[PDB]
Design a protein around this ligand. Structure first.
Ligand SMILES: NC(=O)[C@H]1CCCN(C(=O)[C@@H](Sc2ccccc2)c2ccccc2)C1
Ligand SMILES: [Zn+2]
Length: 139
């Protein structure tokens, strides 16, 4: 679990969005596993606007942060799960690192701010949904 809180927006994994997220929907994209909802309170986070390919992520299943080298956002095949059919997930960045069910929503940060959130895992890999291209989150 986990979310990004920026301005009057909450960014969560689309497959973990709540009834309240859907009632206050701003934007969602099944191919990216992202959903953004509106909030009444001002958020605690800053979004990176950069091309970093190194950063640190929080892994809830280890209660630890880990440094990672990750690929640029791209279209990657993801196996069918209870949440989605087998499909290509877009804007996804992969890295070598631990990730298991429950780690979705952990934040990946670089020196410039929030880069994205955990969205996929298994086999000693961790995949992050990028948010750096969503410039409207800043306004
Ligand atoms: N479509 C998606 O964005 C995800 C929805 C939930 C299921 N997805 C996963 O990747 C799963 S279990 C997995 C393990 C090995 C190979 C494939 C999947 C998982 C594991 C670790 C962290 C987060 C999620 C895909
Ligand atoms: Zn950066």
């Amino acid at each position: 679990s986990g979310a990004i809180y920026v301005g009057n927006y909450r960014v969560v994994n689309r497959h973990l969005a709540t009834h309240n997220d859907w009632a206050n929907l701003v934007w969602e994209d099944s191919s990216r596993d992202l959903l953004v909802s509106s909030t009444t309170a001002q958020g605690c986070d800053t979004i990176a606007r950069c091309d970093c390919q190194t950063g640190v992520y929080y892994c809830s299943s280890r209660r630890k942060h880990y440094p990672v080298s990750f690929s640029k956002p791209s279209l990657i095949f993801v196996e069918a799960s209870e949440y989605y059919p087998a499909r290509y997930q877009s804007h996804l960045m992969l890295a070598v690192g631990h990730s298991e069910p429950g780690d979705c929503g952990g934040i990946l940060r670089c020196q410039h701010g929030v880069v994205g959130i955990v969205s996929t895992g298994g086999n000693g890999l961790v995949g992050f949904a990028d948010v750096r291209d969503l410039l409207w989150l800043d306004e």
